[PDB]
Amino acid sequence: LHRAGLLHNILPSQSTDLHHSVGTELLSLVYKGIAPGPSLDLSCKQLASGLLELAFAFGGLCERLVSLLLNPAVLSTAHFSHGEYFYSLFSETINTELLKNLDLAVLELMQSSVDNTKMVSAVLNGMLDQSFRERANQKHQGLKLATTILQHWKKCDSWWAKDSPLETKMAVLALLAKILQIDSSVSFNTSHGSFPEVFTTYISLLADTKLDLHLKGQAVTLLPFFTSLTGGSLEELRRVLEQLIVAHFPMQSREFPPGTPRFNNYVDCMKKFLDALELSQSPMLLELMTEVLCREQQHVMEELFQSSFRRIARRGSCVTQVGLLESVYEMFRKDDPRLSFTRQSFVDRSLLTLLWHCSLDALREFFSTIVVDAIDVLKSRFTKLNESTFDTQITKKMGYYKILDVMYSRLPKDDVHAKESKINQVFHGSCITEGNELTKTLIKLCYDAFTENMAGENQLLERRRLYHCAAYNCAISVICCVFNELKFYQGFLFSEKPEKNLLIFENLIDLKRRYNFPVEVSTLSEEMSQFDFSTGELEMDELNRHECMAPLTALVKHMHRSLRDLPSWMKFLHGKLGNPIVPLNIRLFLAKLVINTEEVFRPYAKHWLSPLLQLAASENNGGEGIHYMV
Amino acid sequence: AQEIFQAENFRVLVKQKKASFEEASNQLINHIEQFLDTNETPYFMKSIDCIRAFREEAIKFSEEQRFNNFLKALQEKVEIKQLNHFWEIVVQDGITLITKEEASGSSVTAEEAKKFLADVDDLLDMI
Amino acid sequence: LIRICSKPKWKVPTYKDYVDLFRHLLSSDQMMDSILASLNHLLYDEFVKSVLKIVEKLDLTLEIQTMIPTSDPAANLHPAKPKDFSAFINLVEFCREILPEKQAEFFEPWVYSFSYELILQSTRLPLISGFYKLLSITVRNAKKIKYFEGKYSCFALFVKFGKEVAVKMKQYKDELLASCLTFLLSLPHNIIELDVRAYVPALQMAFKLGLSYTPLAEVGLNALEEWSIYIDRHVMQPYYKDILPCLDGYLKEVSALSRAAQKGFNKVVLKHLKKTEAISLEEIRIRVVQMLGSLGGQINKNLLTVTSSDEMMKSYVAWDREKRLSFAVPFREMKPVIFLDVFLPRVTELALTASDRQTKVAACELLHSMVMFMLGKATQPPMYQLYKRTFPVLLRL
């Protein structure tokens, strides 16, 4: 009859109020029947659910239903709720009547928030996960009820205030996560919902030093909803995130045994930061996370960070990619008095990953931005009178070499050879001068590194060695992308001249670190989602770890597929391996390099037996000898 | 037979209480050095609160040699580096050596604060 | 349920070892809670509600994927949501081992409901097994406890659905047909004595399909046993001359333990044995003769009054009036003449019914060779009467 609408002209209300008397008495029966005066079955519940469905089919009765939910009566049993039980018993027809008419069920529910906070939270949460459940064809009531329970957020306000029960703060956090997950990415602009008064809640729950670390780990999952903000609000959010970091994070590194009740909290909060950052490709989240990461010798979770960055760069939205790149770049390039170690860490283990995994298929953006800002600092001249600024210039130069290495290793040849825009901004502006101008300028300034002598240099030796190594790696990368058809790889990377103390291999190899060399080395996965919603190469041993073995081996294999002996790489390394007057370490290094590139030296066997054999057979090797190297 | 069967709160606590000494001093020296290495203003207020706490505990625990040695070390560090902001925030409040009688305790006004703190070229075009 | 019904180097056991857990959750229960401080009833009811929920929401329907199959189960044997389908399957076996028992008083109120919606789904999802399997589980639980001493609404439901499924079953193939037969022959039927002429083809197809699928033989045996021991002994009689004669074909290395046994016996055989349920066909024959004598000699003579020859004579007659297919097998010098006809029947029925892969392959190769032989032989002998015998087997093959 109700489907035919003939429910009232076949069953009326008397000369009474506009409410339906029949519905009122049926609903009273269903409310106080399951109450004791008990027993329960499945067919009884099927009836009673049909009975209250009938009761709601009459007319409004919604405010009466809500008053029943918040009715604070107590039913004794050895005395639990008496008003929640009516809800949890049915919990589905109830909530599909509350979602039958919005803006009044929610209003009448939240009005008594301070009185029945348990009940109002329970019913609002049930309405929420009810509406989340039916979004496939009805992702309309979800948005409306989320926005509507936001429009009254100033009513449910005592929950998140200070000195509240530190169970309703996380309760409202769970409710609020639910609300944001329902609606679209809308609650940030022009006060779509209650912009000011809802942020004040997020900022306050992530601000005060009276909450916990797991509570805010729950909180820092709102971040992917709130990283698309702008100047004022985003600056305030970044402020409060920064006080979070300073106030609750370990100062530089672990300094926590794995198991103490700080390390586990720290790892939880950090991994939640990290997966949030992997959701929202938000620059300043990279600022914070790299900042904390690249501040120790090696973070405990290095592989997590690196996989996260691999995801971050691999996303699309190329403007956001370039924003992440420029953000970490400017974090390194800036003149902040940061430690040399930390500053070079910023490029080593943060932005090289981002550059390796996505820059662009035919990128210009980042490299075009930095061409005539990093070339000029590579051309800068040192001042060996102060330790600090000299060290920082070394680190920045090293980093620029590494970044150029990454582009030249990834960027295809043409958009750095041809008459281009990516290139034409070191000389004379973007005019058509000659082509390949920065190729040759970078070649000069790189070959001038790792070949500059170190006679009078006795201040920062290991750092300068790393400088030379990075410069030489950059050189190898650019030369693999210079014209690279004739004997180009020989003039540079090889063929130096000791007339004025040009020494490639002597300078990048250590020569005083004594190697040890030990002897040997769906419609049911959906119901997963609704429960989710309503709950919350080689052996890298000691001389493959020299930051030049892998590049040199790749370069050698490349030269193999590019054209007695060959002029100065077969023959110059031949003559630096042969005579036992070259320092030991260069000779060990070249033995390692020829081992790893064995396939190259198969045609050249008759030349390549004497020096390896006399290196194995000689007695110069320290300890009991280079035994696994033998 | 008879012989075989018959974080900040933890750091605040560390600054407050410590069974030993001069190891907490060393660790806080390292902490403030790394804090001054970075340039977050919250770390700057962290450093100023730390030095205030160190001065308070030095006064309340009969010790001045540590206070003046620390002050000399930080003065030299700010002089030799680019920590102008740290020195500015220090002089905003004012931290100076004991000015009573250059000793443990006295009842003399502070005057030290004012008196001390008022070939290859051819290889290119072969392409 | 939703998980351990969804689980289809690292090893993943799927559901077969969750089972004892769930059985102790409800049945082996008084022997584990006694050390603590009922739950059996609550957990059984929760398990049944949950399984009803999952059946309610799984979209077990099927879709056709890119001839014209008359088999209603067809290429359509491909669900829309295969994860749901595998979930239902894990569900059916999980319930099958959770619900043969623990019904001492627990399944007492669930029979009518559980049935009613299994019939409702299985009527709009007809060609989906496991529905039938849950029906057989619930009817056998309604049989262990009595529940059928005349409620009557579910009685009429079972009668009508048994008739409908028994008529629809005559189309179903192996797994579906097996589930339907195990359902039908699990009705109490000492309560449905009526219209027994429609439940006999479902017992002779569960006998004929035995000899290869032993549990179907077992259900057929329990069926016939109950029909004999409880149905009235005047209506069960006319339906013996066509229920026994389909029961006649039934009556036709160096491991760790070995090394431990060889090397004496000192605690090694103990641990090796400590490290270590399809019914056996021999026991099936044993029970066939056991109840065959247990049913007397008055009833018994119907095992071999089929007709004493009906269609095995078609296998016991000369396929042709006069022999053809004379094949001179070439030796060095003599080349004697064999006849391929004589062993053509045995070869052509070894090809079809072999139950041995190597023998089947050999027999199929011979039929291939002989077919080519016999189509060659008439090219250069009126011989169609053996085509008439051998094409109805080329099409079957």
UniProtKB/Swiss-Prot annotation, chain B:
Quaternary organization: Heterodimer composed of XRCC5/Ku80 and XRCC6/Ku70; heterodimerization stabilizes XRCC5 protein. Component of the core long-range non-homologous end joining (NHEJ) complex (also named DNA-PK complex) composed of PRKDC, LIG4, XRCC4, XRCC6/Ku70, XRCC5/Ku86 and NHEJ1/XLF. Additional component of the NHEJ complex includes PAXX. Following autophosphorylation, PRKDC dissociates from DNA, leading to formation of the short-range NHEJ complex, composed of LIG4, XRCC4, XRCC6/Ku70, XRCC5/Ku86 and NHEJ1/XLF. (Microbial infection) Interacts with human T-cell leukemia virus 1/HTLV-1 protein HBZ.
Description of its domains: The EEXXXDDL motif is required for the interaction with catalytic subunit PRKDC and its recruitment to sites of DNA damage.
Further remark: Individuals with systemic lupus erythematosus (SLE) and related disorders produce extremely large amounts of autoantibodies to XRCC6 and XRCC5.
Linked residues for Glycyl lysine isopeptide (Lys-Gly) (interchain with G-Cter in SUMO2): 81, 100
Compartment(s) of residence: Nucleus; Nucleus, Nucleolus; Chromosome
Superkingdom of the organism of origin: Eukaryota
Function as written in the Swiss-Prot or TrEMBL entry: Single-stranded DNA-dependent ATP-dependent helicase that plays a key role in DNA non-homologous end joining (NHEJ) by recruiting DNA-PK to DNA. Required for double-strand break repair and V(D)J recombination. Also has a role in chromosome translocation. The DNA helicase II complex binds preferentially to fork-like ends of double-stranded DNA in a cell cycle-dependent manner. It works in the 3'-5' direction. During NHEJ, the XRCC5-XRRC6 dimer performs the recognition step: it recognizes and binds to the broken ends of the DNA and protects them from further resection.
Induction (record text): In osteoblasts, by FGF2.
Modified sites of kind N6-acetyllysine: 72, 77
Protein name: X-ray repair cross-complementing protein 5
PTM field: ADP-ribosylated by PARP3.
Residues of the full protein shown: 550 to 732 of 732
Gene symbol of the encoding locus: XRCC5
Family: Belongs to the ku80 family.
Swiss-Prot record, chain C:
Domain of life according to the entry: Eukaryota
Disulfide cysteine pairs (residue numbers): none
PTM per Swiss-Prot/TrEMBL: Autophosphorylated at two clusters, the T2609 cluster and the S2056 cluster. Autophosphorylation induces a conformational change that leads to remodeling of the DNA-PK complex, requisite for efficient end processing and DNA repair.
PTM-bearing positions, type N6-acetyllysine: 267
Subcellular locations according to the entry: Nucleus; Nucleus, Nucleolus; Cytoplasm, Cytosol
Phosphoserine: modified positions: 326
Function recorded in the entry: Serine/threonine-protein kinase that acts as a molecular sensor for DNA damage. Involved in DNA non-homologous end joining (NHEJ) required for double-strand break (DSB) repair and V(D)J recombination. Must be bound to DNA to express its catalytic properties. Promotes processing of hairpin DNA structures in V(D)J recombination by activation of the hairpin endonuclease artemis (DCLRE1C). Recruited by XRCC5 and XRCC6 to DNA ends and is required to (1) protect and align broken ends of DNA, thereby preventing their degradation, (2) and sequester the DSB for repair by NHEJ.
Illness: Immunodeficiency 26 with or without neurologic abnormalities: A form of severe combined immunodeficiency characterized by reduced or absent T and B cells, recurrent candidiasis, and lower respiratory tract infections. Some patients show dysmorphic features, severe growth failure, microcephaly, seizures, and impaired neurological functions.
Name of the protein described by the UniProt record: DNA-dependent protein kinase catalytic subunit
Full-protein positions shown: 487 to 972 of 4128
